[PDB]
Structures are given as C-alpha cells and as structure tokens.
Subunit: 182 residues, 6 copies
Amino acid sequence: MFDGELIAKLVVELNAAMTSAQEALQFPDFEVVQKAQPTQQGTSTRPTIFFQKLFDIPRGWPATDWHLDNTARKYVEITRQHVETTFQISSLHWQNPEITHVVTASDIANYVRAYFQARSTIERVKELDFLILRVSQISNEAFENDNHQFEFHPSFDMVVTYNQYIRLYENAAYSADGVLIG
Amino acid sequence: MFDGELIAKLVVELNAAMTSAQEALQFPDFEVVQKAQPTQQGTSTRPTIFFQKLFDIPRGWPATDWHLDNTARKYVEITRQHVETTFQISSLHWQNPEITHVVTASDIANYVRAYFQARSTIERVKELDFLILRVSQISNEAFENDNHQFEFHPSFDMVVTYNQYIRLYENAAYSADGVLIG
Amino acid sequence: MFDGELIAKLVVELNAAMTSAQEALQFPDFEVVQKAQPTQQGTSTRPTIFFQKLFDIPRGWPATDWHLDNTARKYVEITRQHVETTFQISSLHWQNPEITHVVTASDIANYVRAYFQARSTIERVKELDFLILRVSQISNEAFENDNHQFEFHPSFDMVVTYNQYIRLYENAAYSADGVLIG
Amino acid sequence: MFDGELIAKLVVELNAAMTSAQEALQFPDFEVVQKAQPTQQGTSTRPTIFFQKLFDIPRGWPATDWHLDNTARKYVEITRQHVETTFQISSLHWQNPEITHVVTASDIANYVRAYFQARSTIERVKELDFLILRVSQISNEAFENDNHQFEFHPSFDMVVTYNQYIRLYENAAYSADGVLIG
Amino acid sequence: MFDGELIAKLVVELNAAMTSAQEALQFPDFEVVQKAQPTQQGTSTRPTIFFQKLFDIPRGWPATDWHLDNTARKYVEITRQHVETTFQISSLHWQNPEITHVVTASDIANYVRAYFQARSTIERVKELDFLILRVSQISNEAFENDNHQFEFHPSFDMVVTYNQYIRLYENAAYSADGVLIG
Amino acid sequence: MFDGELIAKLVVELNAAMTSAQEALQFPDFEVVQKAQPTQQGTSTRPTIFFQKLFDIPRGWPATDWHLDNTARKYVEITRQHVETTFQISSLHWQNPEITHVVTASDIANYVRAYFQARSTIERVKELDFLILRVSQISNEAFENDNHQFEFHPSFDMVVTYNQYIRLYENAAYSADGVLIG
C-alpha cells in the first residue's frame, strides 16, 4: 500500500488508542507525532506518543497473476509481495513528585501495547488490510532531559504485515502450430 | 495493576526488610529511595537502598474472557496479560576503618536478597497479587566516590510477576437462523 | 564481462526502472548517479537513486576449455569463472510537510526493488547476459542533512551473477609413441 | 557468615601462607593489604599481596528448617543458603637487576596459589567452616610503575564456599479437626 | 626456502601477469611495488599493484630425514616443514571521467586474481617449487585520497605453500652388544 | 617457585639457537634480550630476540606423596603440580634496500621456531626438565620506527611444561586400636 496510506491509518489507530487510554487512566491530554520531523520543531510538554519506521522485510517469493485486456490484446502482469514492516513506538511523560495521583510513562506505553494486542482491535483493523504480530519486550531507558533532572523513555517494537502491488505489461499469443518429424 | 500500586507495595516490602535487617545486623539507620529522581536531589550519608525498573516481558498470549451486561445488551471484553518485570536493587554504605564492629554494603545486599527468597515472605506477599522468581547473582563494583575515597556499590536484580487488565466493549447476538438447500 | 559494461547496463536498467516508477507515483523528476564521484561534485536536490559496488565472490572452481588454432599449431585456453557481484542501492528524497500528495523515499526504494524482482524484467535482462538473486532486506536510516532538518536514507543490497573470460596460449601435440618392456 | 568473619579469616591464612613463602624463598618482608581502602593510601615498597571480593552466586534453592519455641508457642524458621564468593588475589614486587638471588612476583603468586591447593591446608581450613575450589589460571600483566621501570602484576581468582543463615518467626498449630459429608 | 627468493619469484610472476593484463585491457603503463618500504617514499601516479605478507601457518608435524657422512662418522639430520603463507594483493587506479575508454582498478585486480588461478599458471609455477590455493573474495574500499577525490582500493588474499629446510648434526652408532639373564 | 632458573635455561637455549642461525644465514651480529626491562633502557640496532612470559595453567589436580622423617617422627608432604607456561618470542631487524644479500626478520623468527621444534633439541632439552609443545602460528606486524621507515615485528607463542614442588609438614601415627560391640 506504500507508506502514506499506512502512516495515515496508523495515526488514526494511535489516536483512538490514546483516547481509550485517556478514559482509562485519566491523564490530562495527549499528542500523536512522528519522531523524525522534516523541519526544525520543538517537543511538547503534554504526554506524548512517538512512532517511527525502521527497516523492512519482503517475506517470500513474489507471486504473479495475469489479467488480460481484450481491447488492446495485452496481458497485464500484477505482482504481489507480502511485506513486513517494524515500527518503533515510544512515549514521554514527566513525573511531578507532589501529585498524589500517579501515572507512569511505562503505564501509557503498556496500555498502548495491550490495546493493539487485543482481539477486537485486530478484528477491526483486518478490514483496514493489515494485521499485527506479537510484541515481546518493553524497555525503560533513563536520560537526563533538557531541564537536567531525570526522565524515562519507554519503547517497544511492533510488526505490521501488508501487501504491495506493482503493475506491468506483457504480450499475448492466440494460436499455436507445430511440425512432426520422424 | 500497572506501576503505582506495584511501586508502593515494593516500597513497603523493602521498608519491612530493612526493619528486620536493622536488628539483624545493627545498622545505625537506613533509608529506602528510588533511583532516577524527577527532581534534582542529593544523596544521603546513611545505609541506603535504591531500586529501579528495567524492562518488561509479556510472557504468553493474551487471554480474553467475556462478561455480559444485560441492561445495555453488551459484552464487555476483559483481556488479561501476565507480565514479568525486572527491578534492580542496589545498596550504598561507607566503611569507617576505625570502628571495630564491621558491616559491609554487600552484607546488607545479601541480607535483603535472602529476605525476599524466604518461604514466609513469599506466602505473605502472595496476598499482594504478585510473586518472585529466583535471584542468580550479586556483584560488587568499586568507584572513586565524590570524596576521592574508594567505595563499593553492590547490586542485583529481582523479578516479580503479576497480571495486567484491560477492558473493552463488544456487541452481542441473541438469536440464530439459517437456510437449507440441496 | 568486466565492470564497465556491467555498470553501463545497470545504469540503463535503472533509468528504465525510474521512468516506470515516475509514471507510477508522479515524482517531480528523477536522476541516476553513482556514489563515489571521482571529481568533486555537490549532489542534487531531486529524487535521486544511488548505486555502488562492494564485495566480489568467485563462486566455484574455474572451468577451462580448449580451442585449437590450426594455422599456428597452438591451443588457446579459455578459462571461465562464474562471478557474483554485490551492489548497494540507496535513494534520497526530502519530504515537504505542507504538500498533501505524499511520496516517501522508502516508497521509491521499495518500488525500485520490486521492479528488479519481477519476472518480466528478469526475462528482459537475461539476454543482457546476467541474472539477479533474491533481495532480503531494506533499511531506513535517519541523518541530519546539510540543512539542520532531519531526513531518511533507505538502502538495500542487490546481487548480480555473470561470467568472466580470460584467454591464454598452450602448446599442442600431434603424435604419440612408446616402448614395451617385459 | 557474612563478610567480616570471612575476610578476617582469609587474612589470617593469607598471613600464614606469606610466612611459609618467606621461609621458602627468603623474602625481605611482606604485607597483606586489601585492594580497596576507604581512606586515602600510598602503597608500600615491599613484597605485598592483595585481595578483593568480586561477586556472589547463590548456588541452589534455599533450605528451610523449623525449630520450635515451647515457651512462646512459635516456630523459628531458619533458612540456609550456600554461596561461592569468588575472590581475586594479586601480588606486587619490583625486580632489582643487579642482585644475584632472583625471585619474581610470579613466584610469589604461584607459591600462594599452591599453598591454598594443598590438601593439608584444606583439612585445616575445613574446621573454619569454608572450603576452596580449584584454580585454573594465573596471568602476568605489565604496568609502567610511575612513568618509569616496567613492572609485572600477576593475579588469579579463588573461590571459597560457605553457608549463610537467616532467622524468622512463624505461627504454630496444636490440634486438628474436620467434617465428613457424603 | 626462505623469504627473499619467495619475494623474487613472486615479483617476477606479478610482472608477467601485468604484462599480460596490459595487452588484455590496454592500460597506459603499470608498476609493481611492495607495501614494505624501508625508506620514506612517495607512491606513483600510475596503475600500480601492491603486495605484502600477513602471517604464516606451520601446517603439519615436522618430518625428519637422516643422511650419513662416512668420512666424519656423523648423521646429518634434515628437518622439513610444509609452510603455508598468506599474501595480500591490492591495486590502485584513478578514474578520469572524461575518457570514453573505461577500465577500473577492480578490473585489474580481477584479472590479476584470475591469472594466478589458471591451470597453465599453476603448471608454470610448480617447477618454481611452490603452489597456490583457492582465492575466495575480493572487496572494494573507498577512501578520500590526498586530492580530496574519492577512489577505490580493491584487495584480496592469496596463499602460497612451500617447504622449509634446516640441518643439524647427530652422533652415529656402528655396533650392538647385549647380555642375556634368566 | 621455579621461574628464574627457567628463564636462565631459556636464555642459554636462545643463545645457542642464535649461534646456529648466524652460522646458517650470515647475520652481522645478534643479541638476546628480555622484554619489560625493570630499568629505563634503549633498544639496540643489532638483530635482536625478545621474549616474555604471559600466563600459566595448572593443568591437572595436584599430586601428593608422603616421605617420612624417622628422627623427628613427622611426614614431609610433597605436592607436585605440572603447569604450562606461555612464552612470546619476537624479533626485530631493519631492512637495508641497497644491500644485495637479503635476510628478513621473518626468516629469523622462522628459523628460531624451527630450531625449537626439531627432535634433536627436544631430546637435549629433556635433560633440562621441561618440554615444548607445538607452535601453530607466526604473524607479521608493521611499526613506524623513527616517524618513518616502516618495520616488521614478527612474533609467535611457545608453550613450556614442567613440574614445580612445594613442601609441608604433617603428623604421623604408629599404632591402632578399636572396640567391638554388638
């Protein structure tokens, strides 16, 4: 389907997941942004979710099927490749130490991970022409932020499988003949 | 169960472990603190315990069970995931060579590890909805320290397993019909 | 077949693939350039494709056949080696956020890869005296660009197999004789 | 036993081994020094031996034993663990090149290692509640002293196994009853 | 058979190979030099080939033979070891983009490698008391060059097997005596 | 114990090997020198041999045998350990391009290696209470010398096995008695 359609669908799904998480855990507000912005921009203080695409795998020999155009007397050769892409998803949130109600960035990451692994969401995204494999690890990494202090940047990887289509032209034959020799 | 409840329970358990270890080995005093403080802080010159969260393991396919709400004619889908989290426990203590009564930081770390591996503590913590696996190594590391005096920072990691719950909605059907052809 | 002819054939094939991709996805314009420019150059602000040559495997023991020159009474020894050359192909394209029609550099790389894996292109290139093996991965890498805005540099590896020929001289014999001893 | 008793003992047998080695090879004098001083130090220009604790291995599931206190009607739960507590031994000596009688630092390290591997020393140590495993390697490393006079620093690792004890309380029951239904 | 004659024979063979390659591919001129310049030198701006020895493998237990000197009543013990040595062959050539006739440094490296693998070359070499094993890889590497212009430095490894001889003396016996007891 | 004597014997053997090599290959003159000099010293221009001791391996459980002292009524417990020592041998020689008679540093290293692997030298060394195992590699490395004049530093490893002894005291018993019960 190529990137743009997949990215748009993933953004919509992430927005829905973040809305569900906000109702579930009661954190103030959220944003969904892509990690590598093509223009000089600044981070947002709101609880944020990030995504990025990193490497790709073709997964299998290409499959070709032939469709015939009668008017022009040509075969249209369609080749389909079943591709797998891995997306990195990470979140960010700063912990105010004098608020009695506590929600962690790891909690947001875990909830977003669990939402995408549910069977209902898989059933819903099936009609969006892609499925999701299993997620096996979520890690907490600590850095020193920009205001100094300390902060966590949890992250995990997701795999999305879909189909890629290309179109080409080929000649067609309409009769056969031979010779027999003894 | 997520993080806040888990962290609070672990803090209470660590406080109890130090309460025991103080009569066990005759410390001056103790404190339990978390690593990665969100605010700038200074360390304390007393026997101290530090803990931190490293990563998570989903450990198995999600399990879904269905509960029916009769009034609104809806199924509420409950999905449970059995997660494993690794916490890194470390201690700090400075050795005064003049005192004749000697207690080591590695000694405190060993006692804390032994406390969590006892059968009685596991039986008591079972009602707190998580359990502990085995601990396989404790390591001593030496650093220069701010006062240019060599010091030890023993550490080990611990694993606790629990359940995470998410909640969603789904439609319900109340009748069936079909057609038979031959 | 040595490197230069292979490079020319690869260049014309890449130009054809780029024309097909432009008709497929509506690029502004394209360009095919080699990476390691001998003379100093400055790169172009267009959707471009890059290729480079790296590694070389001989793949098998050499095979020799003999052709006889009657006039000079000499054997001409021809030795053929079936070579496997690896090419790395990468692309560049800067995403402009405000335009609604979106095409990514990874899309260009994916289409170029898919073109070279099609069966019709293999049939066309066979009469050009080389064939292509399977491609197994594509990777996205993010760098900082000469402007201080982020960018992506997708890449993948391609394998091309062909034959190499060398000619040498050797003496010839025209009669035999022996002695029998008992 | 915890660190203090073990370290004091190891010091005592280290002094005994050094005395035996001095009678064996006619050293000037010797010292036994730990390789982590909490206070600033300066090291000594003498044939010295160094030791330090590296890490720990719990080595097996804990074993619990129950001892009953009749007066208070309580069980005292004793838990025993059997650890390994690897140590690192290293020596230092400067080789004066114009003395006929020659002894190397590697000689000191080898003799100290051989002393601890003898069966008589093992039998004597056994009454001190720990035992020694096998030693597999000794290595020479070249320093540069203090911007002069290249020097050698031999080292090797040693393992001493023992038991660790912890005590806890638990309730006790004195009678049983039941109900039979069919 | 030690290094000096090895290098002499190798440079003669490389000169012959380059004379053949010049006819085959029409270089302007060539030159063979070593990468072990004992004196400061400055390289040449001509198609150049380089060689150097990396290491050595003994390849087998030594084989001893005994030859008797009657006049001096001594055995001369000859020991032979079948040595394998590794040489690195690499080439340099700068690409002028304006010339229409194109030849690559990779082409020169490939031709030189192919020349040494031919049957006729091995037959010629055999009477020079060494042989060549199989070559398995050639790699292109790009560097900045002293004119700030990219260029390639292809290289590959070759293996040469030969024999080494040393001679020593040993006593000789000429009679035997015995005693029989029961 | 038993190291300085080993170095003295090894130095004598190396001097003999260099005498043989000088007669065999016509060196100007030679020197045998140990690395890691305990005093600030300078390298010599003459063809030189450098040796060093790297590490030791105990190779087997210790073996104890008992010798009885009748006068003092004590057992003298002798423990023997059969260790292996790894020595690194390297040579240095600067090539003069204008002299027609050529000898390489690798030739010196190879001749020294071959001398120690001969059966005659092993038989002669057997009376000196140690033996040599097999040598499996010799490598060339390039230094930079005096800011230019690249140079080679060939090296290889040798293994020497021997026995080392320790002596200790133990009590003795002279009679036995028992009790039989039923």
